[PDB]
GROMACS .gro file of C-alpha atoms in nm:
model
  121
    1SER     CA    1   0.000   0.000   0.000
    2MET     CA    2   0.073   0.368  -0.033
    3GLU     CA    3   0.026   0.418   0.348
    4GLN     CA    4   0.290   0.147   0.432
    5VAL     CA    5   0.535   0.334   0.203
    6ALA     CA    6   0.453   0.679   0.375
    7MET     CA    7   0.513   0.503   0.712
    8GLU     CA    8   0.841   0.353   0.586
    9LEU     CA    9   0.955   0.703   0.469
   10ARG     CA   10   0.880   0.833   0.830
   11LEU     CA   11   1.074   0.545   0.994
   12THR     CA   12   1.352   0.609   0.744
   13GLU     CA   13   1.364   0.975   0.829
   14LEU     CA   14   1.354   0.887   1.206
   15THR     CA   15   1.646   0.656   1.141
   16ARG     CA   16   1.813   0.948   0.963
   17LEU     CA   17   1.760   1.177   1.263
   18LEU     CA   18   1.864   0.905   1.519
   19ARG     CA   19   2.182   0.839   1.318
   20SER     CA   20   2.277   1.206   1.360
   21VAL     CA   21   2.178   1.192   1.735
   22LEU     CA   22   2.389   0.876   1.778
   23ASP     CA   23   2.692   1.046   1.621
   24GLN     CA   24   2.655   1.348   1.844
   25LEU     CA   25   2.630   1.130   2.160
   26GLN     CA   26   2.922   0.919   2.060
   27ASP     CA   27   3.143   1.233   2.019
   28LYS     CA   28   3.083   1.299   2.388
   29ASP     CA   29   3.280   0.975   2.453
   30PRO     CA   30   3.619   1.058   2.308
   31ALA     CA   31   3.791   0.794   2.517
   32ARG     CA   32   3.574   0.523   2.347
   33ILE     CA   33   3.479   0.370   2.685
   34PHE     CA   34   3.126   0.297   2.547
   35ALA     CA   35   3.210   0.207   2.187
   36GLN     CA   36   3.195  -0.171   2.211
   37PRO     CA   37   3.035  -0.441   2.433
   38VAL     CA   38   3.204  -0.512   2.759
   39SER     CA   39   3.419  -0.821   2.678
   40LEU     CA   40   3.292  -1.140   2.849
   41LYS     CA   41   3.640  -1.289   2.791
   42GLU     CA   42   3.794  -1.001   2.998
   43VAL     CA   43   3.500  -0.954   3.245
   44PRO     CA   44   3.371  -1.313   3.269
   45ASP     CA   45   3.130  -1.232   3.564
   46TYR     CA   46   2.972  -0.932   3.385
   47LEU     CA   47   2.631  -1.087   3.319
   48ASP     CA   48   2.601  -1.180   3.686
   49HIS     CA   49   2.596  -0.802   3.750
   50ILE     CA   50   2.442  -0.647   3.437
   51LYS     CA   51   2.134  -0.808   3.285
   52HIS     CA   52   2.095  -0.597   2.975
   53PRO     CA   53   2.439  -0.493   2.842
   54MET     CA   54   2.451  -0.213   2.594
   55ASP     CA   55   2.707  -0.010   2.392
   56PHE     CA   56   2.722   0.221   2.095
   57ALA     CA   57   2.811  -0.047   1.834
   58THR     CA   58   2.511  -0.260   1.944
   59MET     CA   59   2.287   0.054   1.913
   60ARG     CA   60   2.420   0.126   1.567
   61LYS     CA   61   2.336  -0.228   1.451
   62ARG     CA   62   1.979  -0.182   1.573
   63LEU     CA   63   1.958   0.161   1.418
   64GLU     CA   64   2.066   0.039   1.073
   65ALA     CA   65   1.812  -0.244   1.078
   66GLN     CA   66   1.554   0.041   1.140
   67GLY     CA   67   1.498  -0.121   1.477
   68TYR     CA   68   1.407   0.198   1.671
   69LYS     CA   69   1.027   0.269   1.638
   70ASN     CA   70   1.044   0.602   1.827
   71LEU     CA   71   1.293   0.821   2.022
   72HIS     CA   72   1.184   0.667   2.356
   73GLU     CA   73   1.326   0.324   2.248
   74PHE     CA   74   1.656   0.486   2.141
   75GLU     CA   75   1.682   0.676   2.474
   76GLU     CA   76   1.615   0.356   2.663
   77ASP     CA   77   1.929   0.201   2.506
   78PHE     CA   78   2.142   0.516   2.571
   79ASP     CA   79   2.033   0.518   2.933
   80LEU     CA   80   2.136   0.145   2.963
   81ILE     CA   81   2.489   0.234   2.855
   82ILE     CA   82   2.513   0.494   3.133
   83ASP     CA   83   2.322   0.313   3.405
   84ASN     CA   84   2.504  -0.021   3.356
   85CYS     CA   85   2.840   0.158   3.391
   86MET     CA   86   2.740   0.349   3.702
   87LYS     CA   87   2.634   0.024   3.871
   88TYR     CA   88   2.931  -0.200   3.766
   89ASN     CA   89   3.196   0.060   3.834
   90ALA     CA   90   3.260   0.248   4.157
   91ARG     CA   91   3.222   0.622   4.187
   92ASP     CA   92   3.598   0.688   4.198
   93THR     CA   93   3.673   0.522   3.860
   94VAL     CA   94   3.746   0.665   3.518
   95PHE     CA   95   3.458   0.452   3.387
   96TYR     CA   96   3.194   0.587   3.627
   97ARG     CA   97   3.315   0.942   3.571
   98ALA     CA   98   3.300   0.895   3.195
   99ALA     CA   99   2.937   0.784   3.221
  100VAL     CA  100   2.844   1.088   3.428
  101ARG     CA  101   2.999   1.324   3.171
  102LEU     CA  102   2.822   1.139   2.884
  103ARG     CA  103   2.489   1.165   3.061
  104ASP     CA  104   2.535   1.535   3.131
  105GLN     CA  105   2.651   1.623   2.780
  106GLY     CA  106   2.402   1.394   2.608
  107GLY     CA  107   2.111   1.568   2.785
  108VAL     CA  108   2.144   1.874   2.564
  109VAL     CA  109   2.143   1.668   2.238
  110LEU     CA  110   1.850   1.460   2.356
  111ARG     CA  111   1.648   1.766   2.459
  112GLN     CA  112   1.668   1.910   2.107
  113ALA     CA  113   1.612   1.571   1.944
  114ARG     CA  114   1.279   1.537   2.125
  115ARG     CA  115   1.170   1.883   2.004
  116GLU     CA  116   1.272   1.778   1.639
  117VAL     CA  117   1.085   1.447   1.655
  118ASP     CA  118   0.763   1.619   1.783
  119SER     CA  119   0.814   1.917   1.542
  120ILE     CA  120   0.872   1.714   1.218
  121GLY     CA  121   0.617   1.448   1.339
   0.00000   0.00000   0.00000
């Protein structure tokens, strides 16, 4: 149908906007602490601690499969990156501190993204 196509153009444009959002968030992580999954070879107990691991490469895979239906789903995954880190790592660590700085800087990008998603529909 013509409607399904219209819908698919919307999802495609959402994917377009979320790709730009993802790039902006990932620049706030210049150390690349959040770039890849925590290694289960190097942290073999990780899944005993963290039930839903997340990282920017995993988000990108989902994004490119047009797997985010709305901004809320995308934010859920970004918040997992941060929240997982802040639980696994202690407050006095470079990892915890990196997550705090990502959360704080990401806020600004996410605030405008929400306005753009509502604005453009």
